[PDB]
Ligand binder design. Structure first.
Ligand SMILES: *[C@@H]1O[C@H](CO)[C@@H](O[C@@H]2O[C@H](CO)[C@@H](O[C@@H]3O[C@H](CO[C@H]4O[C@H](CO)[C@@H](O)[C@H](O[C@H]5O[C@H](CO)[C@@H](O)[C@H](O)[C@@H]5O[C@H]5O[C@H](CO)[C@@H](O)[C@H](O)[C@@H]5O)[C@@H]4O)[C@@H](O)[C@H](O[C@H]4O[C@H](CO)[C@@H](O)[C@H](O)[C@@H]4O[C@H]4O[C@H](CO)[C@@H](O)[C@H](O)[C@@H]4O)[C@@H]3O)[C@H](O)[C@H]2NC(C)=O)[C@H](O)[C@H]1NC(C)=O
Ligand SMILES: O=C(Cc1ccc(Cl)c(Cl)c1)N1CCc2ncnc(Cc3ccc(F)cc3)c2C1
Ligand SMILES: [Ca+2]
Ligand SMILES: [Ca+2]
Ligand code: NA
Ligand code: NA
Ligand SMILES: [Zn+2]
Length: 807
């Protein structure tokens, strides 16, 4: 119930939301059908449109008008945005030359530069260049301010997850808005674009910027706008709020445009009909900036122009139907479109089996345009699993395609409406969106590399003097965007110090069931091999210092000629193995006599070692090595690679991947990058939360043993950004690529896996590309502790994702 017979007189776009049944006058009242009876008359005035003209200049104030051209409008804060231009001979903001804003130039009583977020729905990154001729205000923001060539959204690349990620700094799995449509089985409730369940606060987790601000004494404009409030009125409302007295005036504001997404769905991302909505958005930016100029705030406010996601060409004819794969299609519920999520239609159906659904969807058609996954097997870079609102079965849809349950769903929702959609994998080029920052706190005429939208919350907090709530950004990684207000983090403190074991065990103390043909025997070289075991080559193989262990554990540093490792006494294998391969390095084979060689490590007790007999008896599990024997520096150094302390558990199907990486790809990268440093290791994430598992969370061991089975294997591959310098003698910035490969007992993910590894392994690794920060979370390790570089620069490096998309 609403008693809509209250009034909006003096309450138009009030900031505090009043409680039912009392009627409302705020920017969401329309969405709730709760506005007071006189809201349209008083708060949505339209008379005479949005622009002054010469004949209105100095008019007598008429309070029916949408905006004002009368002499008193400036002091009232309600002039049309073109008032000074039409009536006082001033220029539009866009026609003024760019001049660096070295310091805020703010009116008396401003405590801090305000922040205005200008968010555009469906604004694909390439519109900045492709539409630049019809967007002159946006182009001035972009060229005069700080911009990225693009900004990466989160997955799924849908509106609500991405706008709420912008506001929170959180992955969708953590904030809880995991799609535009959702079912929460604990609540037994559904969230939809249409309707009323989406208003309940239990959907919306984390802490959005407006709450963060309010909690710390900073006032916030409301970030949401009911669809029927015209854009011109949204802008005039912001400008009116900016004229409030100092004690009442918000410091942070957002504008939201439904364009160009709305037209992009109908016309495609580059439809000829797209020119007009891009023009109209630019006009709106112009209104804002002209309005700020009238208030003398154009060199005071920080403005962020940001999109939520891009837009791809998608049509009804590019739809895959689950009815063409599954016999039992009426036993499932599908969340359809540009991603798929499947669950049982009835929780009472005990014949529902996800294994059989996954199998019926795997590599069935030669050009199949989606791939099924248990959510825990999705690329870790997506961070899309750890929420009960994410169904166990996920379909990753190829760009340009849709998935649906049955054909009747697509023509009874038989011709086609739409030409554009989004939601795909967030590394897809067409899903990338925009970022521009303009203002005193941003840099002048500065291009920055692409970054992820999860990082902006921290920066917006920095722009407002707020302490961010706990989030998934890496605070400091965007310091290079800012003139001032940088956040200067310290490196985390190492929690566990390593042991440095010497030779403490005799060979005969080991009963590991291992054998090695190594009984093959000099004082020149004897001292020399001892030196290697004490760390004499470590400067070459450990280039950025040893990783810091950020949790409590027992581990040993093991040195060798060709590699260094941090060996866990708890997990019976390395946490990390580091080695450098020069451009000139040669690949060799595993000699015949060493094919099955595993050697006891006399620095590590039998009790903290793996054993070969476990692998013999586990018919499912084999082993591999972290430092690859193929890249040994000499026949004698090769023996080190067969130490039991370099061994890790590997399914034979995974060994195909791993061996190709080690034998072929590492050397290829060293040739292309002028040497690489590699750090490899295991990851255990059995509860798919993106964070390192403790010992008691491990669900699988090598049969009969205490040797835990990794869920994934990582590698971090670092070289010199200036590739004329070798990786091991680099004076300047670094370049990195990394992966987190799922450790799976089949290659069902790769439909072409019966072919030679040269046709499928590298494609797999690109899909599972990762940020160093992703690996940090998953291992509790902190990398790049000892470089010549600034810590902020290193944080940027750690957040880099190598995407393997072209321009
Ligand atoms: C990205 O950044 C975020 C934010 O930093 C990281 O997420 C944090 O991760 C922490 C560890 O996983 C987690 O800490 C836990 O907090 C519990 C209290 O949580 C509530 O309060 C906080 C603070 O206000 C609030 O933010 C939480 O909000 C979540 O839950 C509500 C639903 O009620 C949602 O609205 C909201 O969207 C959010 O959901 C997300 O997080 C939860 C997990 O909290 C997931 O289940 C969801 O799927 C979703 O992803 C909460 O309202 C606290 O109780 C936990 O403590 C347990 O574990 C510790 C281990 O040290 C143990 O010592 C304790 O005993 C305790 O265990 C007991 O409970 C167990 C389970 O019932 C039981 O098994 C035991 O036997 C014990 O009885 C824990 O400390 C923190 O909440 C989240 N924060 C958020 C906002 O998500 C995230 O990790 C980052 N991601 C990456 C990849 O780095
Ligand atoms: O205003 C809207 C349309 C809208 C209208 C009425 C209702 Cl009843 C609802 Cl629910 C939505 N929307 C779109 C969805 C959305 N999802 C999450 N956050 C926001 C706010 C926001 C704005 C800018 C920004 F950079 C970050 C966040 C937004 C903003
Ligand atoms: Ca959107
Ligand atoms: Ca985990
Ligand atoms: Na075996
Ligand atoms: Na396969
Ligand atoms: Zn859309």
């Amino acid at each position: 119930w609403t008693a809509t017979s209250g009034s909006c007189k003096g309450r138009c776009f009030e900031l505090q939301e009043v409680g039912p049944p009392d009627c409302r006058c705020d920017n969401l009242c329309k969405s709730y059908s709760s506005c007071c009876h006189d809201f349209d008359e008083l708060c949505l005035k339209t008379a005479r449109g949005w622009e002054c003209t010469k004949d209105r200049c100095g008019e007598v104030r008429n309070e029916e008008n949408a905006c004002h051209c009368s002499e008193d409008c400036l002091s009232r804060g309600d002039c049309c945005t073109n008032y000074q231009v039409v009536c006082k001979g001033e220029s539009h903001w866009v026609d003024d030359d760019c001049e660096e804003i070295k310091v805020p130039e703010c009116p008396a009583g401003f405590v801090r530069p305000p922040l205005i977020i200008f968010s555009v729905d469906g604004f694909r990154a390439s519109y900045m260049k492709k539409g630049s001729k019809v967007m002159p205000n946006i182009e001035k923001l972009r060229s005069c301010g700080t911009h990225a060539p693009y900004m990466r959204p989160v997955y799924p690349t849908k509106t609500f997850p991405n706008l709420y990620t912008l506001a929170t700094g959180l992955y969708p799995e953590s904030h809880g808005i995991v799609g535009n449509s959702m079912y929460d089985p604990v609540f037994d409730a559904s969230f939809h674009l249409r309707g009323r369940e989406k208003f309940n606060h239990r959907w919306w987790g984390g802490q959005p910027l407006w709450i963060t601000a309010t909690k710390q004494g900073v006032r916030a404009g409301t970030f949401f706008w009911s669809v029927s409030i015209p854009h011109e009125r949204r802008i005039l409302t912001i400008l009116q709020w900016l004229s409030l007295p100092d004690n009442e005036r918000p410091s942070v504001y957002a504008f939201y445009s439904e364009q160009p997404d709305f037209s992009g769905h109908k016309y495609g991302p580059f439809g000829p009909e797209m020119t007009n909505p891009l023009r109209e958005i630019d006009k709106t930016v112009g209104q804002l900036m002209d309005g700020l100029k009238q208030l003398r705030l154009h060199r005071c406010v920080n403005v962020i122009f940001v999109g939520d996601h891009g837009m791809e060409d998608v049509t009804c004819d590019r739809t895959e139907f689950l009815s063409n794969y599954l016999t039992n299609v009426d036993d499932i519920t599908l969340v359809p479109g540009t991603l798929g999520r499947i669950r049982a239609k009835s929780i009472n159906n005990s014949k529902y089996d996800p294994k059989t659904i996954i199998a019926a969807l795997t590599c069935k058609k030669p050009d199949q345009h989606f791939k099924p996954y248990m959510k825990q097997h999705l690329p870790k870079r997506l961070h899309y699993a750890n929420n009960r609102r994410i169904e166990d079965i996920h379909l990753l849809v190829d760009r340009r395609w849709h998935v649906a349950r049955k054909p009747l769903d697509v023509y009874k929702k038989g011709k086609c409406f739409f030409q554009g959609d989004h939601g795909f994998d967030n590394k897809v080029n067409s899903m990338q969106t925009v970022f521009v920052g303009y203002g005193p706190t941003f840099k002048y005429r500065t291009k920055v590399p692409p970054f992820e939208n999860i990082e902006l919350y921290n920066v917006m907090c920095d722009l407002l003097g707020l302490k961010p709530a706990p989030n998934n950004g890496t605070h400091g990684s965007l310091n290079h965007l800012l003139r001032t207000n940088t956040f200067r983090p310290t490196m985390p403190d190492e929690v566990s110090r390593p042991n440095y074991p010497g030779i403490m065990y005799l060979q005969s103390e080991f009963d590991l069931g291992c054998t090695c043909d190594d009984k093959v025997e000099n004082k020149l070289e004897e001292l020399n091999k001892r030196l290697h075991t004490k760390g004499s080559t470590k400067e070459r193989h450990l280039l950025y210092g040893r990783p810091a262990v950020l949790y409590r554990t027992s581990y040993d540093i093991l040195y060798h000629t060709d590699f260094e490792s941090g060996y866990s006494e708890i997990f019976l294998m390395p946490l990390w193995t580091s080695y450098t391969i020069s451009k000139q390095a040669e690949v060799s084979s595993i000699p015949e006599h060493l094919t099955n060689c595993v050697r006891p490590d006399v620095r590590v007790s039998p009790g903290f070692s793996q054993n070969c007999l476990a692998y013999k008896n586990d018919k499912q599990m084999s082993y591999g090595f972290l430092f690859p024997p193929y890249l040994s520096s000499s026949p004698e150094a090769k023996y080190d690679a067969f130490l039991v302390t370099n061994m890790v558990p590997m399914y034979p199907a995974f060994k195909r991947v791993w061996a190709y990486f080690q034998r072929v790809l590492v050397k290829k990268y060293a040739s292309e990058r002028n040497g690489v440093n590699v750090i490899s290791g295991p990851i255990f994430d059995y509860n798919y939360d993106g964070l390192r598992d403790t010992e008691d969370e491990i669900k699988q061991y090598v049969e009969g043993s205490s040797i835990p089975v990794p869920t994934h294997y990582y590698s971090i591959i670092t070289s010199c950004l200036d590739f004329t310098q070798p990786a091991d003698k680099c004076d300047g910035p670094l370049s990195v690529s990394s992966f987190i490969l799922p450790h799976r007992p089949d290659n069902d993910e790769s439909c072409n896996s019966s072919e030679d590894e040269s046709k499928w392994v590298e494609e797999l690794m690109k899909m599972h590309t990762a940020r160093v920060r992703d690996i940090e979370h998953l291992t509790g390790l902190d990398f790049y502790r000892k470089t010549s570089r600034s810590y902020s620069e290193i944080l940027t490096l750690k957040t880099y994702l190598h995407t393997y998309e072209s321009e």
